[PDB]
PDB file of C-alpha atoms in Angstrom:
ATOM      1  CA  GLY A   1     -11.307  10.119  19.993  1.00 41.01           C
ATOM      2  CA  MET A   2      -7.564  11.161  19.379  1.00 44.39           C
ATOM      3  CA  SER A   3      -6.142   8.006  20.970  1.00 43.21           C
ATOM      4  CA  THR A   4      -4.098   5.874  18.630  1.00 42.04           C
ATOM      5  CA  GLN A   5      -4.791   2.526  20.527  1.00 38.52           C
ATOM      6  CA  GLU A   6      -8.666   3.516  20.605  1.00 36.68           C
ATOM      7  CA  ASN A   7      -8.787   3.979  16.879  1.00 36.59           C
ATOM      8  CA  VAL A   8      -6.849   0.996  16.084  1.00 36.07           C
ATOM      9  CA  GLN A   9      -9.602  -1.027  18.168  1.00 36.70           C
ATOM     10  CA  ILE A  10     -12.417   0.725  16.061  1.00 36.80           C
ATOM     11  CA  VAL A  11     -10.633  -0.392  12.774  1.00 37.70           C
ATOM     12  CA  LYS A  12     -10.303  -4.137  14.376  1.00 37.55           C
ATOM     13  CA  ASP A  13     -14.268  -3.834  15.112  1.00 36.61           C
ATOM     14  CA  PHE A  14     -14.915  -2.731  11.885  1.00 40.65           C
ATOM     15  CA  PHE A  15     -13.048  -5.895  10.450  1.00 42.15           C
ATOM     16  CA  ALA A  16     -14.768  -8.257  13.129  1.00 42.76           C
ATOM     17  CA  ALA A  17     -18.130  -7.212  12.343  1.00 45.45           C
ATOM     18  CA  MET A  18     -17.618  -7.888   8.759  1.00 45.83           C
ATOM     19  CA  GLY A  19     -16.248 -11.158   9.796  1.00 44.26           C
ATOM     20  CA  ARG A  20     -19.381 -11.941  11.820  1.00 46.58           C
ATOM     21  CA  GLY A  21     -21.542 -10.589   9.036  1.00 44.92           C
ATOM     22  CA  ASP A  22     -22.991  -8.379  11.574  1.00 46.20           C
ATOM     23  CA  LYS A  23     -24.367  -5.711   9.371  1.00 44.33           C
ATOM     24  CA  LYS A  24     -25.957  -3.352  11.916  1.00 45.22           C
ATOM     25  CA  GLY A  25     -22.302  -3.711  14.010  1.00 42.50           C
ATOM     26  CA  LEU A  26     -20.372  -2.775  10.944  1.00 43.53           C
ATOM     27  CA  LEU A  27     -22.470   0.188  10.215  1.00 42.86           C
ATOM     28  CA  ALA A  28     -22.603   1.125  13.705  1.00 41.10           C
ATOM     29  CA  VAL A  29     -18.850   2.082  13.395  1.00 41.33           C
ATOM     30  CA  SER A  30     -18.943   3.444   9.606  1.00 40.19           C
ATOM     31  CA  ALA A  31     -19.420   6.909   8.621  1.00 39.64           C
ATOM     32  CA  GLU A  32     -22.809   7.507   6.509  1.00 41.07           C
ATOM     33  CA  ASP A  33     -20.303   8.847   4.014  1.00 40.86           C
ATOM     34  CA  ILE A  34     -17.836   6.190   4.537  1.00 40.35           C
ATOM     35  CA  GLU A  35     -15.590   6.128   1.505  1.00 38.19           C
ATOM     36  CA  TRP A  36     -13.821   3.053   0.311  1.00 34.13           C
ATOM     37  CA  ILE A  37     -11.344   3.135  -2.609  1.00 34.00           C
ATOM     38  CA  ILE A  38     -10.309  -0.257  -4.287  1.00 34.82           C
ATOM     39  CA  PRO A  39      -7.763   0.166  -7.103  1.00 36.73           C
ATOM     40  CA  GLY A  40      -7.146  -2.006 -10.281  1.00 36.46           C
ATOM     41  CA  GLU A  41      -9.464  -3.959 -12.583  1.00 39.42           C
ATOM     42  CA  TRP A  42     -11.595  -6.559 -10.921  1.00 39.47           C
ATOM     43  CA  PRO A  43     -14.734  -7.026  -9.979  1.00 37.49           C
ATOM     44  CA  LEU A  44     -14.452  -5.184  -6.295  1.00 39.28           C
ATOM     45  CA  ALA A  45     -12.679  -2.400  -7.911  1.00 40.41           C
ATOM     46  CA  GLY A  46     -13.840   1.456  -7.410  1.00 40.17           C
ATOM     47  CA  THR A  47     -14.868   3.866  -5.096  1.00 37.01           C
ATOM     48  CA  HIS A  48     -17.692   2.565  -2.602  1.00 39.97           C
ATOM     49  CA  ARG A  49     -19.227   5.505  -0.942  1.00 41.64           C
ATOM     50  CA  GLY A  50     -21.928   5.342   2.148  1.00 47.54           C
ATOM     51  CA  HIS A  51     -23.422   2.384   4.078  1.00 49.04           C
ATOM     52  CA  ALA A  52     -25.531   0.741   1.220  1.00 51.74           C
ATOM     53  CA  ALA A  53     -22.250   0.573  -0.755  1.00 48.97           C
ATOM     54  CA  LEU A  54     -20.198  -0.746   2.195  1.00 48.85           C
ATOM     55  CA  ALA A  55     -23.071  -3.443   2.550  1.00 49.64           C
ATOM     56  CA  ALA A  56     -23.418  -4.069  -1.124  1.00 47.60           C
ATOM     57  CA  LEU A  57     -19.226  -4.433  -1.280  1.00 45.67           C
ATOM     58  CA  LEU A  58     -19.502  -6.793   1.692  1.00 47.24           C
ATOM     59  CA  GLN A  59     -21.881  -9.058   0.266  1.00 44.82           C
ATOM     60  CA  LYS A  60     -20.043  -9.021  -3.502  1.00 42.05           C
ATOM     61  CA  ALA A  61     -16.775  -9.716  -1.768  1.00 44.57           C
ATOM     62  CA  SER A  62     -18.397 -12.712   0.175  1.00 46.67           C
ATOM     63  CA  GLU A  63     -20.082 -14.350  -2.947  1.00 48.62           C
ATOM     64  CA  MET A  64     -16.891 -13.622  -5.359  1.00 45.59           C
ATOM     65  CA  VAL A  65     -13.722 -15.070  -3.623  1.00 42.82           C
ATOM     66  CA  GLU A  66     -12.651 -17.198  -0.747  1.00 41.23           C
ATOM     67  CA  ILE A  67      -9.778 -15.192   1.302  1.00 40.90           C
ATOM     68  CA  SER A  68      -7.453 -16.451   3.857  1.00 42.43           C
ATOM     69  CA  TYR A  69      -4.609 -14.445   5.996  1.00 45.12           C
ATOM     70  CA  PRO A  70      -2.036 -16.756   7.164  1.00 43.69           C
ATOM     71  CA  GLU A  71      -0.850 -14.347   9.750  1.00 46.62           C
ATOM     72  CA  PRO A  72      -2.519 -11.527  11.422  1.00 47.58           C
ATOM     73  CA  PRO A  73      -2.233  -7.971  10.006  1.00 48.28           C
ATOM     74  CA  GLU A  74       0.106  -5.574  11.124  1.00 48.35           C
ATOM     75  CA  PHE A  75      -1.039  -2.058  12.306  1.00 44.86           C
ATOM     76  CA  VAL A  76       0.906   1.192  11.854  1.00 44.21           C
ATOM     77  CA  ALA A  77      -0.953   3.985  13.454  1.00 43.83           C
ATOM     78  CA  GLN A  78      -0.820   7.681  14.686  1.00 44.46           C
ATOM     79  CA  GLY A  79      -4.058   9.303  16.044  1.00 44.03           C
ATOM     80  CA  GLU A  80      -6.884   9.015  13.385  1.00 42.19           C
ATOM     81  CA  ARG A  81      -4.452   7.468  11.127  1.00 42.27           C
ATOM     82  CA  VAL A  82      -4.661   3.481  10.838  1.00 44.20           C
ATOM     83  CA  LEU A  83      -2.430   1.925   8.336  1.00 45.87           C
ATOM     84  CA  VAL A  84      -3.066  -1.853   8.078  1.00 41.56           C
ATOM     85  CA  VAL A  85      -0.512  -4.145   6.349  1.00 40.87           C
ATOM     86  CA  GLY A  86      -1.087  -7.795   5.611  1.00 44.69           C
ATOM     87  CA  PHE A  87      -0.950 -10.693   3.330  1.00 45.18           C
ATOM     88  CA  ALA A  88      -4.005 -12.714   1.680  1.00 44.91           C
ATOM     89  CA  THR A  89      -4.237 -15.977  -0.477  1.00 45.56           C
ATOM     90  CA  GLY A  90      -7.452 -16.120  -2.051  1.00 43.06           C
ATOM     91  CA  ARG A  91      -9.577 -18.367  -4.953  1.00 43.65           C
ATOM     92  CA  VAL A  92     -11.845 -16.523  -7.265  1.00 44.07           C
ATOM     93  CA  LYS A  93     -14.903 -18.596  -7.217  1.00 43.52           C
ATOM     94  CA  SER A  94     -15.899 -17.945 -10.735  1.00 45.18           C
ATOM     95  CA  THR A  95     -12.609 -18.542 -12.080  1.00 45.66           C
ATOM     96  CA  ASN A  96     -11.431 -20.986  -9.683  1.00 46.84           C
ATOM     97  CA  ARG A  97      -8.054 -19.308  -9.957  1.00 45.75           C
ATOM     98  CA  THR A  98      -6.200 -18.640  -6.819  1.00 42.66           C
ATOM     99  CA  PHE A  99      -4.285 -15.282  -6.295  1.00 45.53           C
ATOM    100  CA  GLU A 100      -1.632 -13.872  -3.446  1.00 46.42           C
ATOM    101  CA  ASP A 101      -1.483 -10.270  -2.400  1.00 49.91           C
ATOM    102  CA  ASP A 102       0.756  -8.194  -0.058  1.00 50.68           C
ATOM    103  CA  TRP A 103      -1.421  -5.243   0.972  1.00 47.82           C
ATOM    104  CA  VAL A 104      -2.008  -1.976   3.014  1.00 47.23           C
ATOM    105  CA  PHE A 105      -5.299  -0.570   3.891  1.00 47.33           C
ATOM    106  CA  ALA A 106      -4.791   3.192   4.793  1.00 46.47           C
ATOM    107  CA  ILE A 107      -7.759   4.176   7.091  1.00 46.01           C
ATOM    108  CA  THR A 108      -8.993   7.552   8.672  1.00 43.78           C
ATOM    109  CA  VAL A 109     -10.984   7.590  11.749  1.00 42.67           C
ATOM    110  CA  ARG A 110     -13.197  10.510  12.306  1.00 44.20           C
ATOM    111  CA  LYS A 111     -15.154  10.934  15.531  1.00 43.12           C
ATOM    112  CA  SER A 112     -14.864   7.204  16.330  1.00 44.37           C
ATOM    113  CA  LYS A 113     -16.236   5.829  12.980  1.00 45.65           C
ATOM    114  CA  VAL A 114     -14.356   4.686   9.644  1.00 46.41           C
ATOM    115  CA  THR A 115     -14.668   7.478   7.349  1.00 47.51           C
ATOM    116  CA  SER A 116     -11.919   6.886   4.626  1.00 48.90           C
ATOM    117  CA  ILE A 117     -10.187   3.596   3.460  1.00 50.11           C
ATOM    118  CA  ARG A 118      -8.043   3.251   0.313  1.00 46.79           C
ATOM    119  CA  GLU A 119      -6.295  -0.128  -0.537  1.00 49.98           C
ATOM    120  CA  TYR A 120      -2.835  -0.539  -1.826  1.00 48.92           C
ATOM    121  CA  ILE A 121      -2.828  -3.902  -3.703  1.00 51.57           C
ATOM    122  CA  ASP A 122      -1.385  -6.040  -6.343  1.00 50.62           C
ATOM    123  CA  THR A 123      -3.724  -4.995  -8.927  1.00 51.63           C
ATOM    124  CA  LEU A 124      -2.005  -7.217 -11.738  1.00 49.07           C
ATOM    125  CA  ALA A 125      -2.421 -10.272  -9.630  1.00 47.81           C
ATOM    126  CA  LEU A 126      -5.883  -9.534  -8.872  1.00 48.29           C
ATOM    127  CA  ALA A 127      -6.519  -8.837 -12.578  1.00 48.35           C
ATOM    128  CA  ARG A 128      -4.720 -12.184 -13.732  1.00 44.71           C
ATOM    129  CA  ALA A 129      -6.831 -14.240 -11.261  1.00 42.86           C
ATOM    130  CA  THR A 130     -10.012 -12.811 -12.348  1.00 41.33           C
ATOM    131  CA  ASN A 131      -9.193 -12.429 -16.362  1.00 43.50           C
TER     132      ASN A 131
ATOM    133  CA  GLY B   1       6.052   3.694  22.658  1.00 45.03           C
ATOM    134  CA  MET B   2       9.099   4.671  21.437  1.00 44.55           C
ATOM    135  CA  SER B   3       9.671   8.352  19.820  1.00 45.90           C
ATOM    136  CA  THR B   4       9.629   8.349  16.019  1.00 46.74           C
ATOM    137  CA  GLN B   5      10.842  11.754  15.143  1.00 43.37           C
ATOM    138  CA  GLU B   6      14.290  10.633  14.333  1.00 44.42           C
ATOM    139  CA  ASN B   7      13.084   7.784  12.254  1.00 45.64           C
ATOM    140  CA  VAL B   8      10.909   9.770  10.305  1.00 47.68           C
ATOM    141  CA  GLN B   9      13.932  12.198   9.799  1.00 50.46           C
ATOM    142  CA  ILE B  10      15.969   9.487   8.413  1.00 52.32           C
ATOM    143  CA  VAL B  11      13.346   8.564   6.010  1.00 52.58           C
ATOM    144  CA  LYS B  12      13.051  12.174   4.947  1.00 51.99           C
ATOM    145  CA  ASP B  13      17.173  12.202   4.552  1.00 52.12           C
ATOM    146  CA  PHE B  14      16.682   9.161   2.357  1.00 51.49           C
ATOM    147  CA  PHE B  15      14.768  10.624  -0.201  1.00 51.95           C
ATOM    148  CA  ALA B  16      16.733  13.823   0.118  1.00 48.24           C
ATOM    149  CA  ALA B  17      20.021  12.365  -0.671  1.00 45.34           C
ATOM    150  CA  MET B  18      17.826  10.670  -3.274  1.00 44.51           C
ATOM    151  CA  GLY B  19      16.290  13.799  -4.872  1.00 44.99           C
ATOM    152  CA  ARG B  20      19.527  15.577  -4.608  1.00 46.14           C
ATOM    153  CA  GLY B  21      21.657  12.561  -5.906  1.00 45.74           C
ATOM    154  CA  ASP B  22      23.804  12.668  -2.714  1.00 49.51           C
ATOM    155  CA  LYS B  23      25.107   8.942  -3.456  1.00 53.72           C
ATOM    156  CA  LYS B  24      27.591   8.724  -0.337  1.00 55.39           C
ATOM    157  CA  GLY B  25      24.785  10.663   1.982  1.00 54.39           C
ATOM    158  CA  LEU B  26      21.886   8.253   0.553  1.00 52.60           C
ATOM    159  CA  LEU B  27      23.804   5.058   1.308  1.00 53.03           C
ATOM    160  CA  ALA B  28      24.814   7.066   4.540  1.00 51.83           C
ATOM    161  CA  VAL B  29      21.060   6.620   5.743  1.00 51.59           C
ATOM    162  CA  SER B  30      21.018   2.943   4.310  1.00 49.94           C
ATOM    163  CA  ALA B  31      21.697  -0.319   6.019  1.00 47.75           C
ATOM    164  CA  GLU B  32      24.502  -2.427   4.358  1.00 45.94           C
ATOM    165  CA  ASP B  33      21.857  -5.077   4.205  1.00 44.15           C
ATOM    166  CA  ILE B  34      18.993  -2.771   2.894  1.00 42.49           C
ATOM    167  CA  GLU B  35      16.326  -4.646   1.168  1.00 42.35           C
ATOM    168  CA  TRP B  36      13.928  -2.949  -1.271  1.00 42.17           C
ATOM    169  CA  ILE B  37      11.083  -5.168  -2.566  1.00 42.35           C
ATOM    170  CA  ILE B  38       9.269  -3.667  -5.513  1.00 44.46           C
ATOM    171  CA  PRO B  39       6.220  -5.756  -6.670  1.00 43.56           C
ATOM    172  CA  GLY B  40       4.568  -6.314 -10.323  1.00 42.24           C
ATOM    173  CA  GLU B  41       6.078  -7.132 -13.654  1.00 38.98           C
ATOM    174  CA  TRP B  42       7.956  -4.189 -14.860  1.00 40.47           C
ATOM    175  CA  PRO B  43      11.542  -3.127 -15.099  1.00 42.33           C
ATOM    176  CA  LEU B  44      11.864  -2.151 -11.473  1.00 40.71           C
ATOM    177  CA  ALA B  45      10.057  -5.207 -10.038  1.00 39.54           C
ATOM    178  CA  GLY B  46      12.162  -7.483  -7.844  1.00 37.48           C
ATOM    179  CA  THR B  47      14.011  -7.246  -4.669  1.00 36.26           C
ATOM    180  CA  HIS B  48      16.755  -5.024  -4.647  1.00 39.15           C
ATOM    181  CA  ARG B  49      19.528  -5.885  -1.789  1.00 38.09           C
ATOM    182  CA  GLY B  50      22.548  -4.015  -0.798  1.00 39.92           C
ATOM    183  CA  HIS B  51      24.323  -0.845  -1.511  1.00 40.67           C
ATOM    184  CA  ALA B  52      25.364  -1.758  -5.001  1.00 42.59           C
ATOM    185  CA  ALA B  53      21.817  -2.828  -6.066  1.00 40.61           C
ATOM    186  CA  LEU B  54      20.450   0.250  -4.564  1.00 42.43           C
ATOM    187  CA  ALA B  55      22.475   2.428  -6.923  1.00 40.01           C
ATOM    188  CA  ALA B  56      21.840   0.253  -9.857  1.00 38.06           C
ATOM    189  CA  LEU B  57      17.922   0.963  -8.975  1.00 36.34           C
ATOM    190  CA  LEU B  58      18.221   4.220  -8.881  1.00 36.76           C
ATOM    191  CA  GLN B  59      20.216   4.536 -12.162  1.00 38.85           C
ATOM    192  CA  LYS B  60      17.931   2.215 -13.989  1.00 40.64           C
ATOM    193  CA  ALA B  61      14.858   4.112 -12.597  1.00 39.36           C
ATOM    194  CA  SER B  62      16.559   7.223 -13.899  1.00 36.65           C
ATOM    195  CA  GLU B  63      16.771   5.651 -17.219  1.00 36.32           C
ATOM    196  CA  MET B  64      13.202   4.380 -17.927  1.00 39.04           C
ATOM    197  CA  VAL B  65      10.702   6.633 -15.942  1.00 38.98           C
ATOM    198  CA  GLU B  66       9.916  10.215 -15.649  1.00 40.69           C
ATOM    199  CA  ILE B  67       8.001  10.598 -12.257  1.00 44.32           C
ATOM    200  CA  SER B  68       6.631  13.614 -10.603  1.00 43.26           C
ATOM    201  CA  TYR B  69       5.258  13.933  -6.982  1.00 46.10           C
ATOM    202  CA  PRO B  70       2.421  16.838  -7.131  1.00 45.39           C
ATOM    203  CA  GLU B  71       1.711  16.957  -3.136  1.00 46.87           C
ATOM    204  CA  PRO B  72       4.114  16.200  -0.511  1.00 45.46           C
ATOM    205  CA  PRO B  73       3.825  12.580   1.000  1.00 44.68           C
ATOM    206  CA  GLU B  74       2.123  11.775   4.172  1.00 41.27           C
ATOM    207  CA  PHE B  75       4.446   9.870   7.079  1.00 41.39           C
ATOM    208  CA  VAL B  76       2.666   7.461   9.425  1.00 42.36           C
ATOM    209  CA  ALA B  77       5.268   6.215  11.863  1.00 42.64           C
ATOM    210  CA  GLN B  78       5.082   3.918  15.125  1.00 44.95           C
ATOM    211  CA  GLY B  79       7.499   1.800  16.666  1.00 46.56           C
ATOM    212  CA  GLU B  80      10.379   1.274  14.001  1.00 49.89           C
ATOM    213  CA  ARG B  81       8.301   1.508  11.291  1.00 50.30           C
ATOM    214  CA  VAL B  82       7.388   4.334   8.799  1.00 47.92           C
ATOM    215  CA  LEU B  83       4.986   4.389   6.173  1.00 52.19           C
ATOM    216  CA  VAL B  84       5.229   6.735   3.427  1.00 53.92           C
ATOM    217  CA  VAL B  85       1.730   7.364   1.786  1.00 52.75           C
ATOM    218  CA  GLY B  86       1.968   9.205  -1.544  1.00 53.30           C
ATOM    219  CA  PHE B  87       0.810   9.882  -5.226  1.00 52.18           C
ATOM    220  CA  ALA B  88       3.092  10.233  -8.300  1.00 55.31           C
ATOM    221  CA  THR B  89       2.287  10.989 -12.175  1.00 55.32           C
ATOM    222  CA  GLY B  90       4.652   9.520 -14.508  1.00 56.51           C
ATOM    223  CA  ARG B  91       5.721   8.932 -18.067  1.00 53.22           C
ATOM    224  CA  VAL B  92       7.732   5.686 -19.401  1.00 50.56           C
ATOM    225  CA  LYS B  93      10.399   6.635 -21.603  1.00 50.15           C
ATOM    226  CA  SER B  94      10.479   3.487 -23.976  1.00 55.14           C
ATOM    227  CA  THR B  95       6.821   3.313 -24.452  1.00 54.86           C
ATOM    228  CA  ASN B  96       5.728   6.972 -23.830  1.00 53.87           C
ATOM    229  CA  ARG B  97       3.035   5.662 -21.846  1.00 55.73           C
ATOM    230  CA  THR B  98       1.731   7.768 -18.914  1.00 59.15           C
ATOM    231  CA  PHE B  99       0.538   6.497 -15.411  1.00 57.61           C
ATOM    232  CA  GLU B 100      -1.047   7.746 -11.957  1.00 58.67           C
ATOM    233  CA  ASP B 101       0.333   5.555  -9.020  1.00 58.42           C
ATOM    234  CA  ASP B 102      -1.416   5.974  -5.319  1.00 58.70           C
ATOM    235  CA  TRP B 103       1.637   4.304  -3.503  1.00 57.53           C
ATOM    236  CA  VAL B 104       2.742   3.379  -0.251  1.00 57.06           C
ATOM    237  CA  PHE B 105       6.403   2.718   1.005  1.00 56.22           C
ATOM    238  CA  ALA B 106       6.370   0.852   4.232  1.00 52.35           C
ATOM    239  CA  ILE B 107       9.861   1.284   5.846  1.00 54.09           C
ATOM    240  CA  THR B 108      11.606  -0.116   8.800  1.00 54.73           C
ATOM    241  CA  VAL B 109      14.431   1.862  10.377  1.00 56.47           C
ATOM    242  CA  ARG B 110      16.946   0.061  12.712  1.00 56.19           C
ATOM    243  CA  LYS B 111      20.132   1.834  14.150  1.00 56.63           C
ATOM    244  CA  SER B 112      19.244   4.842  12.481  1.00 53.35           C
ATOM    245  CA  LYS B 113      19.330   3.238   8.924  1.00 52.97           C
ATOM    246  CA  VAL B 114      16.752   2.441   6.730  1.00 54.31           C
ATOM    247  CA  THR B 115      16.927  -1.505   6.702  1.00 54.82           C
ATOM    248  CA  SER B 116      13.877  -2.652   4.655  1.00 55.27           C
ATOM    249  CA  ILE B 117      11.553  -1.025   2.420  1.00 57.19           C
ATOM    250  CA  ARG B 118       8.224  -2.466   0.475  1.00 56.38           C
ATOM    251  CA  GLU B 119       6.335  -0.980  -2.132  1.00 54.65           C
ATOM    252  CA  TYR B 120       2.688  -1.360  -2.462  1.00 54.23           C
ATOM    253  CA  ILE B 121       1.647   0.226  -5.788  1.00 54.24           C
ATOM    254  CA  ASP B 122      -0.555   0.076  -8.908  1.00 51.57           C
ATOM    255  CA  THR B 123       1.091  -3.144 -10.287  1.00 52.19           C
ATOM    256  CA  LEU B 124      -1.415  -3.551 -12.908  1.00 49.29           C
ATOM    257  CA  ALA B 125      -1.043   0.341 -14.335  1.00 52.70           C
ATOM    258  CA  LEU B 126       2.752   0.287 -14.318  1.00 54.89           C
ATOM    259  CA  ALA B 127       2.775  -3.499 -16.284  1.00 56.35           C
ATOM    260  CA  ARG B 128       0.676  -1.750 -18.770  1.00 54.99           C
ATOM    261  CA  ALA B 129       2.350   1.351 -19.138  1.00 53.12           C
ATOM    262  CA  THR B 130       6.001  -0.579 -19.568  1.00 53.78           C
ATOM    263  CA  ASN B 131       4.416  -3.094 -21.916  1.00 51.94           C
ATOM    264  CA  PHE B 132       4.788  -5.875 -19.180  1.00 52.82           C
ATOM    265  CA  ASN B 133       8.711  -5.656 -19.373  1.00 52.44           C
ATOM    266  CA  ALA B 134       9.704  -7.536 -16.679  1.00 53.13           C
ATOM    267  CA  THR B 135      13.448  -6.655 -17.614  1.00 51.89           C
TER     268      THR B 135
END
């Protein structure tokens, strides 16, 4: 659908399914060829494409870091384009080092499924935290 | 919602005066208390506040980096916000090191003036390319 508010809600549902660890609900709102690009040099960095990749990224993130969001994220959206603006604090479990990150996730929804994600993050800060 | 057409044109005018080097024009669309936040550890990092700082930032950028935008950016606008999504290639003059950067500029427009800018950039890449020059 073309509705900005409906596409924002799809994005929220995507996030929430990941929060619940609802693997089936997450996939239900994700394109079979979903592409998620994470920049930098840290364990989650890379281009993750498809359902298998999405499930694997979810698990890897859960195991590698503890993350908190002090405030709810902001949505800036127009039609099928949904930009999420937020801030996280985290602790890398392997290093026990903490980090902070002001981020944007730029998302494209197509036919009501999350299709493209690119993260814009403090790659230097994440690299330092993970060595 | 409120129409964003005007805000997007102001943001386009902001870069318009930028690339033209229209000092008086660029500040003509810049709030007197304009805040521009640049993350990371490289010469342009920090929060640049006010018109003098804006001018100094643009001068310092011209002195230390060559930057190219191969394709036009995308504007995503809602409310008082305009997020500009783009891609740059560049070269750091002092080190001769090259980089590419996928970036977002998150902009707030109020009273027809750009009031806040925060960049989201590849801070690791820019630190490497500048040899971590926080100055």
